[PDB]
């Protein structure tokens, strides 16, 4: 795993960084929305029940 730097001889740095930026943001947004969907790990709903904001 030492010559991985040669990936930049194959892939253009500008295009990868844009692709990686889009990939990471959309991946991060996806995982957050997955957590929010479930009643557990929806930290917005968790704190409401923990501190009784329903009333």
């Amino acid at each position: 795993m030492s010559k991985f730097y040669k990936i930049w001889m194959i892939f253009d740095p500008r295009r990868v960084f844009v692709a990686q930026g889009v990939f990471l943001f959309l991946l991060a947004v996806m995982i957050h929305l997955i957590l929010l969907s479930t009643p557990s790990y929806n930290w917005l709903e968790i704190s409401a029940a923990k501190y009784n904001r329903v009333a």
Binding site: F4, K6, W8, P13
Partner: protein, 44 residues
């Protein structure tokens, strides 16, 4: 030395070294973020 992008080997090594440092920084923040969540609400 395929050089599709025109970068030399020295340029690739410097670009990769900075890129990996950014990656390890990103990974380090994530590992802390996962520790905080696992402590607050473990999923296993």
């Amino acid at each position: 030395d395929l050089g599709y992008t025109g970068l030399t080997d020295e340029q690739a090594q410097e670009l990769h070294s900075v890129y990996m440092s950014g990656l390890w920084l990103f990974s380090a923040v994530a590992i802390v973020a996962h520790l905080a969540v696992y402590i607050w609400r473990p999923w296993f």
